Design a protein around this ligand. Sequence first.
Ligand SMILES: CC(=O)N[C@@H]1[C@@H](O)[C@H](O[C@@H]2O[C@H](CO)[C@H](O)[C@H](O)[C@H]2O)[C@@H](CO)O[C@H]1O
Ligand SMILES: CC(=O)N[C@@H]1[C@@H](O)[C@H](O[C@@H]2O[C@H](CO)[C@H](O)[C@H](O)[C@H]2O)[C@@H](CO)O[C@H]1O
Lengths: 153, 152
Amino acid sequence: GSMALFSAQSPYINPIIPFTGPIQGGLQEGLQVTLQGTTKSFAQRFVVNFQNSFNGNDIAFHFNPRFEEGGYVVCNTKQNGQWGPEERKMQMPFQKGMPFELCFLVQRSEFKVMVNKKFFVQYQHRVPYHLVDTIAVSGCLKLSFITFQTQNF
Amino acid sequence: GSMALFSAQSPYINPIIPFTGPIQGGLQEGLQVTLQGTTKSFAQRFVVNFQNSFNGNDIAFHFNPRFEEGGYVVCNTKQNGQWGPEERKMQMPFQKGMPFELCFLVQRSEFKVMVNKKFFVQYQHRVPYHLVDTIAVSGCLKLSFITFQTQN
Ligand SMILES: CC(=O)N[C@@H]1[C@@H](O)[C@H](O[C@@H]2O[C@H](CO)[C@H](O)[C@H](O)[C@H]2O)[C@@H](CO)O[C@H]1O
Ligand SMILES: CC(=O)N[C@@H]1[C@@H](O)[C@H](O[C@@H]2O[C@H](CO)[C@H](O)[C@H](O)[C@H]2O)[C@@H](CO)O[C@H]1O
């Protein structure tokens, strides 16, 4: 790509869904988390959660495509079990049955989310990203890799 | 506020709604456009448009509170008369019948929107903001003023 990237931790390969796993050392500015997978042919919804610990009470960033009402994506944060105000992008960048690349870039003030190489949505951090130590993926997809890379030398 | 602010263009004081007027010289990085006003007691919707010319066909940033379905705000861009994909924040930071301060900060890659001095939404620039030379405000509100300020 347009930036030199270096491995952080090692990839999750054909991780079975639902998948929960560590983000080693926590999210860090300049980190890129890329999921490569396929939206299932009769997909209704799927979920990527960047969370603090395993119980899902505290999800810094919930990313939830919904193949409903024309197709839209919900982004939100859960704190002490409580969902905050949703940010809905009224567009569906995934296609049922089709492969996708979904990349999450951690910046100082926001996540930037690309789908198939194109900017899709920004999400302002509501809670500290460094406290996210877990990724959880569930729903109507399959995945061939999750990789973790950084631009930081 | 936490930083000294200086006028960039004189205010529009008590502008009559619907209001359309110049943003003299176009939007600039670092400009803050502040609307001080009151949401009407039975508001349905109101609109703040940052647009290129009087026409309305090209709206860089359409900011549209809707007192509908629990309350939500629509952000979008219009290009050649066509609406792009809506960004909806499913929260209503305005109260019907109540004063508000609504502040748009032009940053290099996004607008930042503050409501009553709290961050409300960000909106990534889809077209260069400097082509915006016109503000249009309409709907269920009144304004005491619109100011244009910079940290300058
Ligand atoms: C219109 C509206 O606000 N709808 C919401 C639902 O989106 C919400 O569903 C939950 O949403 C969260 C993220 O906010 C997460 O995706 C949950 O899986 C999902 O069930 C619902 C219940 O919280 O409230 C509705 O009214
Ligand atoms: C759920 C959905 O996508 N609904 C949209 C409406 O929001 C839209 O209404 C228009 O929205 C634009 C900004 O996007 C502007 O606020 C107009 O005043 C409003 O009429 C409608 C027509 O474009 O499409 C619906 O599908």
